A paper describes a structure:
In the Firmicutes phylum, [name] is a membrane associated protein that coordinates peptidoglycan synthesis with cell growth and division. [name] is a DivIVA-like protein that is highly conserved in Firmicutes. The full-length Sa [name] is a relatively small protein of 114 residues. Its N-terminal domain homodimerizes as a coiled-coil, while its smaller C-terminal domain homotrimerizes, forming a hexamer as the biological unit. Dimerization of the N-terminal domain is facilitated by a pattern of nonpolar residues every three to four residues, promoting the formation of a hydrophobic core in the coiled-coil. This N-terminal domain is partitioned into three regions: a relatively short α-helix with approximately two turns (residues 10–16), a second longer α-helix (residues 28–70) that forms a coiled-coil, and an amphipathic 10-residue loop (residues 17–27) that links these two helices and intertwines with the adjacent protomer, ‘capping’ [name].
Using X-ray crystallography, we solved the structure of the N-terminal domain (residues 1–70) of Sa [name] at 1.95 Å resolution in the P21 space group, with four monomers per asymmetric unit forming two dimers (dimers A and B). The overall structure of [name] is similar to previously determined [name] orthologs and retains the same fold of DivIVA, though it shares much less sequence similarity. The most unique structural feature of Sa [name] is a hinge forming at the midpoint of its N-terminal domain that causes each protomer to bend, adopting pitch angles (θ) of 137–140° (dimer A) and 156–166° (dimer B). In contrast, [name] protomers from Lm, Bs, Sp, and Sa DivIVA are almost linear (θ=167–179°) and practically indistinguishable when superimposed. We find that there is a 3-amino acid insertion in the Sa [name] sequence where the helicity is disrupted and that a cluster of four Met residues (Met45, Met48) are interlocked at the dimer interface at this position (dotted rectangle). These Met residues are only found in Staphylococci and take the place of an aromatic Tyr or Phe present in other orthologs, which normally stabilize the core via π stacking interactions. While the 3-amino acid insertion likely disrupts the continuity of the coiled-coil, methionine is one of the most flexible aliphatic amino acids and may further contribute to the conformational flexibility. Experiments using solution state NMR spectroscopy further support the notion of intrinsic conformational heterogeneity, suggesting it is a bona fide structural feature rather than a crystallization artifact. By extending the asymmetric unit, we found each [name] dimer coordinates two others in a head-to-head arrangement. This involves the insertion of Arg and Lys residues from the membrane-binding loop into the PBP-binding site from the adjacent [name] protomer, mimicking the binding mode observed between PBP mini-domains and [name] in orthologous structures, such as Bs PBP1.
Residue numbers in the entry:
A (entry chain B): 0 to 70
B (entry chain A): 5 to 70
């Protein structure tokens, strides 16, 4: 569908992501992992919105048609 | 409805460590992608609201002329 958006990542991609570890100055893993868990919850919430836009668009079209068919 | 915004992710800093931390360039590059995705999710959320609002309105217009 034309309305479809294409995300770079998915909930599962982020959940599976394995960063290189270093003994150089890097990021505390526990803080990055905890932040990604919130991000995963957000991706999951939004995952079906391509379909939700199509459905709303299609009902929108039907309703406008009924209305015009009155007047 | 979302726990975070693109801005929250854009502005996030992590504590530094010498003790087997994550490579910063890899994490940064990965969050750059998540920030772009959050912009697309905000646009689609806005679209779902506009369409749900329009659909409610169209139903009320049909109902009042019934």
């Amino acid at each position: 569908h034309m309305s479809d958006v294409s995300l770079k990542l998915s909930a599962k991609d982020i959940y599976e992501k394995d960063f290189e570890k270093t003994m150089a100055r890097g990021y505390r893993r526990e803080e990055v992992d905890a932040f990604l868990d919130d991000i995963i919850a957000d991706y999951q919430k939004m995952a079906d919105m391509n379909n939700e836009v199509v459905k709303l668009s299609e009902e929108n079209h039907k309703l406008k048609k009924e209305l015009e068919e009155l007047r």
